[PDB]
Design a protein around this ligand. Structure first.
Ligand code: NDP
Ligand code: 817
Ligand code: MN
Length: 159
C-alpha cells in the first residue's frame, strides 16, 4: 500500500526555502511514529534538506540524475521507486511538492497534519478531491509550550 504523509499549513503550504517554517515537535514525533520501519520515498530536494538517511527505514530518492551518496537507494522514476520497496505492507511517501503530485494518484491513504499557522511558501501540497477520500482518523490539539499553533492529525483512506 502507498501512503503520503505531510504537514499542511494555511492554504496547503508545505515548504519554503527548502524548509517547513513552523515548529511542531508533536508533528515530527507523529512522523517518526508512522514512518518508522517502512520504506520512505522522497525527492532530491527533500533529501538535500535532511542530509542524512532516516533511521530504521529504507530511503529511496527520485532523481532524473545520477546518485551522490551510497547510504541510500537512488531511482529514476515512480515505477522504479515503488519496485525498489519490494513487497512491503505500506510505503511512505514523505515526498516533496512534486513527489506528492506524482504519487497522490496511486495513494491509498493520506496522513495529514493540518497546521493552524499562516506562513507563505513556494511549495504546496497537491489539490486533492476531498470527495473521494474518507476520514478515518482525526485528532485536534490546542497550542502548548512546545507547539505554538493548534493542529490536527488526520488520516484519510481513498474510497
Ligand atoms: N510539510 C511537509 O510535510 C513536507 C514539506 N516538504 C517541503 O517541500 C519542499 C521541497 O519540495 P519540492 O521542491 O517539490 O521537491 P522534492 O523533494 O519533491 O524534489 C523534486 C525533485 O526530485 C526529482 N524528481 C521528482 N520526481 C521525479 C521523477 N518522476 N523522475 C525523476 N526525478 C524526479 C527531480 O530532481 P532532479 O533535478 O535531480 O531530477 C525533482 O526536481 C521543501 O520546502 C521541503 O521543506 C517536503 C516534504 C514533506
Ligand atoms: N507530519 C509530517 N511532517 N509529514 C511529513 N511528510 S514531514 C517530512 C519531513 C521532512 C523533512 C524532515 C523530516 C524529519 F526531520 F522528520 F525526518 C520529515
Ligand atoms: Mn471503499
Amino acid at each position: 500500500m502507498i501512503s503520503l504523509i505531510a504537514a499542511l499549513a494555511v492554504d496547503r503550504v508545505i515548504g519554503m526555502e527548502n524548509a517547513m517554517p513552523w515548529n511542531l515537535p508533536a508533528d515530527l514525533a507523529w512522523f517518526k511514529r508512522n514512518t518508522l520501519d517502512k520504506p520512505v520515498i522522497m525527492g532530491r530536494h527533500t533529501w538535500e534538506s535532511i542530509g542524512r538517511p532516516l533511521p530504521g527505514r529504507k530511503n529511496i530518492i527520485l532523481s532524473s540524475q545520477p546518485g551522490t551518496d551510497d547510504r541510500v537507494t537512488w531511482v529514476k522514476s515512480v515505477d522504479e521507486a515503488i519496485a525498489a520497496c519490494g513487497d512491503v505492507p505500506e510505503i511512505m511517501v514523505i515526498g516533496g511538492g512534486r513527489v506528492y503530485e506524482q504519487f497522490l494518484p496511486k495513494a491509498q491513504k493520506l496522513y495529514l497534519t493540518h497546521i493552524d499557522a499562516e506562513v507563505e511558501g513556494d511549495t504546496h501540497f497537491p489539490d486533492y478531491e476531498p470527495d473521494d477520500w474518507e476520514s478515518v482518523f482525526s485528532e485536534f490539539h490546542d497550542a502548548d509550550a512546545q507547539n505554538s499553533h493548534s493542529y490536527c492529525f488526520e488520516i484519510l483512506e481513498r474510497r
